[PDB]
Design an enzyme around this catalytic site. Structure first.
Site, mmCIF file in Angstrom:
data_model
loop_
_atom_site.group_PDB
_atom_site.id
_atom_site.type_symbol
_atom_site.label_atom_id
_atom_site.label_comp_id
_atom_site.label_asym_id
_atom_site.label_seq_id
_atom_site.Cartn_x
_atom_site.Cartn_y
_atom_site.Cartn_z
ATOM 1 N N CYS A 196 24.499 51.728 13.276
ATOM 2 C CA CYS A 196 25.238 50.648 13.907
ATOM 3 C C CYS A 196 25.603 51.112 15.306
ATOM 4 C CB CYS A 196 26.430 50.233 13.049
ATOM 5 S SG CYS A 196 27.565 51.504 12.508
HETATM 6 CA CA LIG Z 1 30.130 50.032 15.060
#
Ligand SMILES: [Ca+2]
Length: 161
Positions: free
Chosen positions: A97
């Site tokens: 991410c």
């Molecule tokens: Ca993040």
């Protein structure tokens, strides 16, 4: 010095900080065969820079926000993608991410919960021992919600769905 950590023989977890060259160097140096990008930013530059074969780079657009259900909505598809890349195509997977502590960590923990049939706290501690992660509260409830405890022969047995 791309910030990602080997979690086990199959999985890396990390972030993304706008240097695709560092990320590409990490992927190629470490023989990462597949990348799952769990980001709310534009993924086409990451796909282009890594240039992995068709099918070896998966993106789900999802936020880290108690309001976005996109990771939860895609958890089954994501799990099956990891399972098929690891077991049928024998690839290691980088799940990333932006910070590598919540979105990506949530999927890694769930993959370990479900392949090992162990609960959230056990899987979380295993992952946290290799990389300090901190899933947002709503991801913690998501993962706990996948565990069923059933009574049999004077025990509670956990099943991870
Ligand atoms: Ca993040």
């Amino acid at each position: 010095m791309y910030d990602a950590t080997r979690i086990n023989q199959d999985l890396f977890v990390g972030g993304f900080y706008g240097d695709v060259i560092a990320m590409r160097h990490f992927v190629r140096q470490n023989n990462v065969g597949c990348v799952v990008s769990l980001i709310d930013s534009d993924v086409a530059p990451i796909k282009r820079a890594l240039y992995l074969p068709d099918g070896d780079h998966l993106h789900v657009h999802c936020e880290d926000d108690a309001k976005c259900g996109a990771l939860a909505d895609n958890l089954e598809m994501l799990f099956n993608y990891l399972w098929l890349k690891i077991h049928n195509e024998h690839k290691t997977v980088l799940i990333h991410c932006h910070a590598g502590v919540s979105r990506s960590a949530t999927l890694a923990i769930y993959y370990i919960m479900r392949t090992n049939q162990i609960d959230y706290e056990q899987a979380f501690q295993y992952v946290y021992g290799k990389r300090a992660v901190h899933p947002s509260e709503h991801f913690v409830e998501l993962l706990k919600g996948k565990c069923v405890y059933s009574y049999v022969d004077n025990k509670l047995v956990v099943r991870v769905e």
